[PDB]
């Protein structure tokens, strides 16, 4: 019964998920001054040309675009990774207002939203086994700022009317996630966790330096989704972000000077 409300939100999660107070929780604030450039970091290899999107689902917390992960169709390699990580889904976190919504912050600045492309380490065979491992997942995080529209996001925006409430899904084949990326692949990286329950500490976080710009209308339509199921009282799906958590002496590395 976790969520983002006053009664079941981030302050409450530790009671059912005590790792919420763990040693490598996410998100964090990225202090750019103290993140150190690491010349041993490799460029990120994003290979999405064979991606097979399947479906979009309102899960009561966000909406997820799911992919076929039964072969190496859409993979993340390189960067800080030492393995091949398959794309399973992407989703966003966003605010009720343009001035909040991201999970990670940059020098304490919040963005309007944050995109998470979730990948699992193929040496563990399936996502379920990967989330039992400290290097099971790699999440590529991309900030959204409000400005000009993002053309590659519009197909997502225009299906949202058909998944308004929790438990609704719709076909979402032939979506190209390359249209959600910024120009640069420069990144920060650190070891962390899932940002929602069960808060498992599996994730190599890779957060891109360059935000994407989306229009006010695009993010406005995210905010018309509902946390509730059909026939229940309407609760707008807004402010589905966890605040920054203690760094606990982790270090954040930068791929760029
Ligand atoms: C009012 C009902 C609240 O019930 C709950 C049940 C679980 C949580 S948690 N620990 O998963 O966030 C929060 C509230
Ligand atoms: C068994 C795990 C199910 C939940 O999976 C997830 C996957 C990714 C995230 S995030 N927001 O850290 O990208 C949160 C939950
Ligand atoms: Na540092
Ligand atoms: Na297959
Ligand atoms: Zn997320």
UniProtKB/Swiss-Prot annotation:
Catalytic reactions of this protein:
hydrogencarbonate + H(+) = CO2 + H2O; urea = cyanamide + H2O
Q: Which residues bind substrate?
A: 195-196
Its localization reads: Cytoplasm; Cell membrane
Recorded consequence of changing residue 2 to A = Impaired activity, not rescued by 4-methylimidazole (4-MI)
Q: What's the protein name?
A: Carbonic anhydrase 2
Originating species? Homo sapiens
E.C. designation(s): 4.2.1.1, 4.2.1.69
Where do the annotations place Zn(2+) binding? Answer: 91, 93, 116
User: Alpha-carbonic anhydrase domain: from which residue to which, for each copy?
Assistant: 1-256
**Outcome when changing residue 64 to H:** Enhanced proton transfer
Cite the effect that the entry attributes to residue 91 to Y.
In OPTB3; partial loss of activity
An example of a Gene Ontology BP annotation on this entry? positive regulation of synaptic transmission, GABAergic
Q: What is the effect of changing residue 15 to E?
A: In Jogjakarta
Involvement in disease = Osteopetrosis, autosomal recessive 3: A rare genetic disease characterized by abnormally dense bone, due to defective resorption of immature bone. Osteopetrosis occurs in two forms: a severe autosomal recessive form occurring in utero, infancy, or childhood, and a benign autosomal dominant form occurring in adolescence or adulthood. Recessive osteopetrosis commonly manifests in early infancy with macrocephaly, feeding difficulties, evolving blindness and deafness, bone marrow failure, severe anemia, and hepatosplenomegaly.
Provide the effect of residue 4 to F.
Enhanced activity
